[PDB]
RNA sequence: UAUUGACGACCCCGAUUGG
């Protein structure tokens, strides 16, 4: 790695950051590509002719994660789903999906868990000393908007498919 | 659109040992502007302002991007420097007038869309010159720019942008809403003068065996029924239909005519804007239409000038009377007028 | 009268031309052969209409006020929706269309058995995957009900008040048991006396009991073993619980798939309807004091399933000789599913549209949008310039801080079989005296239909003259001032059940409003426009309140503000830039109302228009009763009495004649006594 | 054989196109 000091570490940073934005954008098309996939990271899945939930409930909570610009924005994510998980009938909209309800809270809160789920090795794509957690904790927010993005889309056209 | 300011010129005679030197170290000889500004009349093409001057009759808003939590549907804002502004975008103006142009067009031939796909819908005479069409190569390319735009439009209103995220963020309409709304109309103190500006409302779908609301079809608007708008800026340019009809400056006259006739539909509350059009929104009074010609054609003058009559019969009967007559002469037979 | 009635939706199999299904005319061009352009509409109000602006409503108690929504003139703004919902609705009604806003109505809805049917229960067990029946020394008679006036099938155990102790028995223990048989009236019953568990020694023969009350001993006494089917308290005068001996004679019956899914459903509802009761803590139903909760709501779904050596009353009678079971049932008295869901009655072509060529023309006019799928359109219709033409419109009754109390707007309960369902996919009522089990029952039943709120004709002058005043005790000129709550002890009932609005807009107010219409046939202009020129004392019913008679209109067209063309009349006017004329369809108008209602006709095969029977219920529904009854919410008292128990004349109603919702067009009125 | 008494609010956005 680069001393933090080093001079053309600024430099640097702009380099690690393109590579893992990319890495992220592939590696979520990857893993909204695997119908199963998509039932472990949001609980959203195919049965017979219908999705689970419904397109519009998913449009809808896509229309709300764009506001998750930077970390602290989880209290946005989060009261939305505490909202809408008091209104009963829509609450049940989610029943026969995965858990999707708290699959997303969690997603939206752990902070580890997108990486957990991305799983990609940053070591080649970093030369930073602490790179790695400065990115992380840089990227967090972009990261989620990519892979649940990733995952909406790829599941519609499956749906359509099936349809 | 951009705009220039605070223009500084800064000269080097790199010919010679002072302006190289200075080039190198004294930062060159300023220059004042208005010099050589008075030098020159500034030489503008030809082309047509169109300044419409209206309100919201019935609350208007294009619909914001994402349900709020307290209210469900909420105007569009944007950032105009400093604040936030309710907008209406350059492309639903567009939009609108383009559908009625297109309606007038088929009318007159009897045309129809309901078989072609929305893109075949798209491409009729006359609007395919001035809105322009997409670019599609054929074995040649029937893509040409729209020779009409149309400015975004802005509340007259403005708010800070943390106030606007009071009224996004708020759960309550009884609630924490209220002192939001109360804060961003700029009546802290007055919630009445607040709500005649913004005025949210409740909507309920009712079940027609049971009456009272359908499960889950309840629903509220924040209805911006009290915003004041400034007037819209259409702008025509005249230069590039002009290339369009090869110079043959006479055919001019229909797009010329049909772009009235879309003014008048207009004036005529007949366009609906925005969110809502069928559901009590939308529907705008036109007070004033300002006509700006610059450099135009000498049988096109006329234009110069500002209606107040729907009907624009402000304009000179004679002038109408001419376009009038260019008009049917090519509805009797409505060629690809920019083919030459 | 009952404020609401239905107009009946005829199913529309076969109906063809513009009343039909139709691919929509759509919004491409003005098409020669269809009328476009701009309607002039004036209404005005004939009772005082609300348009409560919830956007400041204010909360005492959870007591909920309202004021009258304005306008940025300050004038009061009557919303354009709910014009259009208004008139979309009357549209829906008059045309016959597909019913544009249906619900959930796809679980079975629930009802309870009258008392009578309990003596028809017999105690029940399910062994391995056999339902089995203890009548025990009882035999069952025809009818299901104990034979030859012998014993009650169960014995009775007292347990909250002269307690057979061995601790007090609990619902799993087997039991060996002595028991008396006991008197009472009409009936006689096996009184348990002494009681063991099981496996212990009973003990000695009691002797002859006391008579407590009118529960006389007989001295008649008998051992016997088996369950004890002890529940809870569940109602206030609950002496007893009952056991089950299996001691003595049997029958077995297997265990159909159909007992699984009813057990399963009813007790799906048992424990869902009182979900919230439960979860904040009450201990027993409100509507009652001193019971507490029937033992199975607050069970866990192990009760919902029916599993091995789980115990039932069951319904079964005598058939051919064969003893069938119906039903299984926790409790003697018990809630019960009607056997059809209120969807599956509704005609496929009547339900909400699911496809852009069933498009039914309310559907094509207003727009649709499809609930389940891709599909939409925009209507060809906008309401627009609503205006208030009056400047003091707003019934402020005289200060700012006064608020009326306004009523019970309860919500519809459509379980109440004999006013929601009909007896014919055509809206025929139900037969009066039938049980409640007839109700959501036959395939070829069907629903009512369109809800209407027939118009308060006949009300007294200056019935809302000083609205403040509780005059409800007074019957002026023979109506009670029926919209105001009473009071209570001389004191406004502000309770969390109704709404308190600070004033209302005054009838003989005058507002406009324009239609703008596009591409519409001359079949739907005929039908628009008939609703819009409908004779004298026609009204239509607008905002909230309409139980109550508020927001009763007359629409009226202005005819020289109106401009109406077809499409080659605009190629006229859109051929020049000049001004033309515009043709006169005030020649056209009562031509096209004839085209419409000739399209009725000859669709609806019925020999004149005025007695198609959506359009005689619609016009009599405008029109209101007219027997000079008044119009109010059931209930036992001609007074509106203060605590407004309507619920006892429905009792009344199910013990007594048990008449249905008359048929709108009949115009019956209901008796004050529905013995 | 038909008696036991009186209370209680509800819905909170839904469906679709996402290039």
Redesign the interface.
Same mark, same amino acid.
């Given at each position: 790695p680069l001393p933090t000091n080093h001079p053309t570490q600024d430099y640097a940073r702009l380099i690690e950051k393109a590579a893992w934005r990319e890495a992220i954008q592939n590696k979520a098309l990857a893993l909204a590509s695997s119908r199963a996939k998509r039932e472990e990271i949001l609980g959203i899945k195919i049965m017979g002719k219908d999705s689970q939930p419904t397109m519009t409930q998913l449009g809808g909570f896509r229309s709300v994660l764009k506001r998750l610009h930077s970390r602290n924005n989880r209290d946005i994510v989060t009261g939305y789903l505490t909202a809408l998980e008091q209104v009963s009938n829509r609450k049940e909209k989610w029943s026969n999906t995965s858990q999707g309800l708290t699959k997303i809270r969690n997603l939206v809160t752990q902070e580890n868990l997108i990486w957990n789920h991305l799983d990609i090795d940053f070591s080649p794509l970093t030369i930073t000393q602490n790179g790695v957690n400065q990115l992380k904790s840089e990227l967090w927010a972009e990261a989620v908007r990519t892979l649940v993005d990733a995952i909406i889309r790829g599941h519609k056209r499956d749906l359509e498919k099936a349809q | 659109r951009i705009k220039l300011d605070d223009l500084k010129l800064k000269s080097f005679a790199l010919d010679k040992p002072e302006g190289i030197f200075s080039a190198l170290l004294d930062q060159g000889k300023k220059l004042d502007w208005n010099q050589l500004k008075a030098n020159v009349t500034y030489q503008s093409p030809p082309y047509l302002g169109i300044s419409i001057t209206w309100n919201p009759?019935?609350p208007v808003m294009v619909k914001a991007?994402?349900?709020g939590?307290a209210i469900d549907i909420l105007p569009l804002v944007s950032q105009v420097g400093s604040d936030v502004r309710f907008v209406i975008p350059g492309s639903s103006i567009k939009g609108i007038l383009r559908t009625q142009a297109?309606?007038?067009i088929?009318?007159?031939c $009897?045309? &129809? =869309?309901?078989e072609k796909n929305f893109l075949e $819908?798209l491409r009729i005479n006359l609007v395919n010159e001035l809105f322009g069409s997409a670019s599609l190569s054929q074995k040649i390319d029937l893509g040409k720019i729209g020779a009409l735009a149309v400015n975004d439009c802005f509340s007259s209103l403005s708010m800070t942008p943390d106030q606007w995220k009071a009224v996004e &963020?708020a759960?309550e309409?009884?609630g924490n809403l209220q002192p939001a709304l109360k804060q961003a109309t700029g009546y802290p103190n007055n919630?009445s003068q607040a709500? !005649?500006?913004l *005025?949210? #409302?409740?909507?309920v #779908?009712?079940?027609?065996?049971? /009456?009272?609301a #359908?499960? /889950?079809?309840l629903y509220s608007v924040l209805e911006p029924? =009290?915003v004041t708008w400034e007037p819209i800026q259409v702008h025509l340019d005249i230069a590039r239909l002009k290339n369009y009809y090869h110079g043959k400056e006479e055919k001019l006259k229909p797009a010329i #005519?049909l772009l009235?006739?879309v003014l008048?539909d207009l004036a005529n509350? !007949?366009i609906?804007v925005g969110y809502g059009? &069928?559901? /009590?929104m939308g529907?705008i009074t036109v007070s004033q239409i300002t006509l700006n010609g610059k450099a135009l054609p000498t049988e096109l003058e006329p234009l110069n000038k500002t209606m107040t009559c729907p &009907?624009?019969?402000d304009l000179d009967?004679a002038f109408? *009377?001419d376009?009038?007559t260019a008009? !049917?002469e090519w509805?009797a037979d409505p060629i690809d007028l920019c083919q030459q | 009268h009952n404020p609401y009635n239905f107009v009946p939706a005829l199913p529309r199999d076969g109906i063809t031309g513009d009343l039909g299904d139709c691919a929509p005319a759509g919004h491409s061009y003005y098409h020669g052969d269809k009328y476009s352009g701009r309607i002039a509409v004036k209404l005005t109000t004939v009772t005082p209409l609300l348009i409560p602006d919830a956007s400041k409503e204010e909360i005492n108690n959870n007591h909920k006020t309202y004021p009258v929504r304005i306008g940025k003139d300050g004038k009061p703004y009557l919303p354009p929706t709910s014009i259009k919902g208004m008139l979309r609705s009357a549209y829906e009604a008059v045309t016959n269309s597909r019913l544009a806003v249906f619900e959930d109505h796809d679980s079975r809805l629930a009802y309870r058995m009258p008392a009578t049917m309990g003596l028809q229960m017999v105690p029940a067990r399910i062994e391995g995957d056999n339902i089995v029946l203890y009548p025990g020394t009882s035999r069952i008679g025809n009818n299901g009900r104990p034979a030859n006036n012998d014993p009650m099938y169960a014995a009775w155990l007292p347990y909250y008040q002269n307690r057979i102790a061995y601790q007090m028995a609990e619902h799993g223990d087997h039991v060996r048991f002595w028991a008396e048989r006991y008197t009472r009236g009409n009936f006689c019953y096996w009184r348990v006396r002494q009681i063991a568990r099981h496996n212990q020694n009973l003990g000695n023969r009691p002797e002859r009991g006391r008579n407590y009350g009118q529960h006389h001993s007989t001295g008649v006494i008998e051992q016997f073993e088996g369950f004890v089917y002890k529940t809870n308290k569940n109602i206030g005068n609950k002496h007893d619980e009952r056991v089950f001996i299996i001691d003595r004679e049997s029958i077995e019956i297997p265990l159909s798939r159909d007992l699984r899914r009813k057990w399963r459903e009813l007790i799906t509802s048992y424990q869902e309807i009182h979900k919230k009761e439960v979860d904040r803590g009450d201990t027993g139903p409100s509507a009652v004091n001193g019971a507490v909760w029937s033992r199975q709501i607050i069970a866990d779904e192990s009760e919902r399933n029916l599993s091995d050596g789980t115990l039932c009353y069951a319904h079964v009678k005598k058939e051919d000789g064969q003893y069938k079971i119906l039903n299984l049932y926790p409790v003697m008295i018990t809630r019960g599913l009607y056997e059809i869901a209120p969807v599956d009655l509704l005609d496929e072509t009547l339900k909400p549209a699911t496809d852009k060529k069933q498009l039914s023309p309310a559907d094509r006019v207003f727009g649709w949008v499809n609930q389940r799928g891709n599909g939409c359109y925009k209507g060809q219709l906008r309401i627009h310039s609503v205006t208030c033409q009056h400047d003091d419109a707003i019934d402020d009754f005289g200060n700012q801080n006064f608020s009326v109390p306004l009523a019970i707007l309860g919500q519809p309960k459509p379980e109440q079989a004999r006013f929601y369902c009909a007896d014919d996919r055509k809206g025929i009522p139900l037969e009066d005296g039938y049980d409640r089990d007839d109700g959501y029952s036959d395939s070829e039943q069907g629903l009512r239909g369109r809800k209407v709120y027939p118009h308060h004709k006949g009300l007294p002058n200056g019935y809302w003259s000083n609205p403040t005043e509780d005059r409800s005790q007074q019957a002026i000129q023979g109506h009670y001032q029926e919209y105001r709550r009473p009071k209570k002890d001389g004191l406004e009932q502000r309770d969390d059940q109704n709404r308190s609005v600070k004033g209302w807009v005054k009838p003989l107010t005058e507002f406009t409003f324009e239609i703008d219409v596009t591409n519409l046939s001359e079949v739907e202009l005929g039908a628009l426009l008939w609703l819009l020129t409908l004779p004298d004392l026609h009204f239509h019913r607008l905002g909230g309140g309409k139980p109550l008679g508020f927001g009763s209109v007359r629409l009226d067209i202005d005819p020289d503000k109106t401009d109406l063309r077809n499409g080659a009349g605009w190629r006229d006017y859109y051929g020049s830039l000049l001004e033309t004329s515009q043709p006169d369809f005030t020649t056209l108008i009562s031509q096209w109302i004839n085209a419409f209602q000739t399209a009725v006709k000859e669709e609806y095969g019925s020999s004149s228009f005025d007695q198609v029977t959506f359009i005689k219920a619609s016009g009599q529904s405008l029109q209101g009763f007219h027997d000079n009854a008044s119009i109010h919410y059931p209930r036992s008292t001609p007074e509106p009495k203060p605590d407004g128990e309507a619920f006892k004349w429905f009792v009344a109603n199910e013990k007594g004649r048990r008449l249905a919702l008359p048929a709108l067009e009949k115009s019956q009125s209901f008796p004050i006594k529905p013995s």
């Open positions: - | 009759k019935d991007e994402g349900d939590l297109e309606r007038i088929r009318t007159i $009897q045309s &129809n =869309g309901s $819908q &963020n759960t309409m009884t919630i709500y !005649k500006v *005025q949210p #409302a409740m909507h #779908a009712v079940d027609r065996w049971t /009456g009272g #359908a499960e /889950g079809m029924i =009290g #005519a009235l006739l008048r509350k !007949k609906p059009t &069928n559901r /009590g529907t &009907n624009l019969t009967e109408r *009377q376009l009038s008009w !049917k509805i | -």
